[PDB]
Ligand binder design. Structure first.
Ligand SMILES: [Mn+2]
Ligand SMILES: [Mn+2]
Lengths: 206, 206
């Protein structure tokens, strides 16, 4: 049906393509059950409200005006859509020259950035997400959020445009890693698509 | 070491005793990794603080006065300790006459109570717990809380003494049920120890 407000973008890889870090079963359930449910519930939650024809960014920017169902499913849809786009089976991507320079000046090195993201992800108690954002000063920042909340939401304290998010809900890693979230965080870097992260950074600065 | 403030209780059954509803691998990780960590981090968090010599119930009753590490691990330890005690491989336990009468007058029947708990469990977005509590007027209530929070905490909306808690963190059900939290909730009734729930009820009314 072309007329639904929100859709899942087709995945640019197979469910078993990311086995360097994420098992195939997780990819399939995570995409076709969890994430698909956020999209369907978002379409339902916005129906008949002022969010009905708004962009996802605009819904998040005014999210406190809407029901909790809009919040949780708008976050869910946005976050997962971003997450799929920043994974890849192709090894060895790296930040653009401009992103690399910004990472080095802000954190020291790519390793130092990964350490900070890993630590933020580990420190998120319960369900949530780790983020790399561009703030309203054009500055890079590492944050985390609970549940499906994100740095675009009106009430979020550390606001900015996400260029990278890593899912630390237990559903994202339990089948392969069980309690070992830190091993998931260490390993996921092998499938992060730094070309996509870099394209998002370019747009955030414009 | 007899002098630590908090210790875990070993399971009063085998890890595979609950395989009607819960896989052995989950029981082992859940008790030896997640719940062991909450106990250890609780003992560390309260050390050298006023919580250091307080009972777990008293810590929780003032938990807003302490750090997040105290709140999260005090809840974690209490909730898991209660959880293990209300599971059993002994099939066909039933509420005591006193508890059954209160259940029937408040909810209508045992099935009605189960429905209500299953619904609270399903509606808890993110990580948390579903609870049956005895409130401060002696009456039964069904609630849910986020993360490791619980009804003994000073800032919980619906306060009371828990007699039954069901863990709806993904780690509690993902290996066996994946996204199907509702199937987990339906099935877990097979292993609820109503004899322990009834003992907790009797004590709560005092
Ligand atoms: Mn997810
Ligand atoms: Mn648990």
């Amino acid at each position: 049906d072309p007329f639904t407000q929100f859709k899942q973008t087709p995945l640019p890889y197979a469910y078993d393509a990311l086995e360097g870090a994420i098992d195939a079963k997780t990819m399939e359930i995570h995409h076709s059950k969890h994430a698909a449910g956020y999209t369907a519930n978002l379409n339902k939650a916005i129906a008949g409200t002022p969010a009905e024809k708004e962009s996802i960014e605009n819904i998040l920017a005014k999210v406190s005006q809407y029901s909790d169902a809009v919040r949780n499913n708008a976050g869910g849809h946005y976050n997962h859509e971003l997450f799929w786009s920043i994974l890849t089976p192709n090894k060895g991507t790296k930040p653009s020259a401009a992103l690399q320079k910004a990472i080095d000046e802000t954190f020291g090195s790519l390793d130092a950035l990964k350490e900070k993201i890993n630590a933020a992800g580990a420190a998120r108690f319960g369900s949530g997400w780790a983020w790399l954002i561009v703030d309203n000063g054009g500055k890079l920042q590492v944050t985390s959020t609970p549940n499906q909340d994100n740095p675009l939401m009106d009430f979020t304290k550390e606001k900015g445009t996400p260029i990278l998010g890593i899912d630390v809900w237990e559903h994202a890693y339990y089948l392969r890693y069980q309690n070992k979230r830190a091993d998931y965080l260490t390993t996921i870097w092998d499938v992060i698509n730094w070309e996509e992260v870099s394209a998002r950074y370019e747009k955030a600065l414009k």
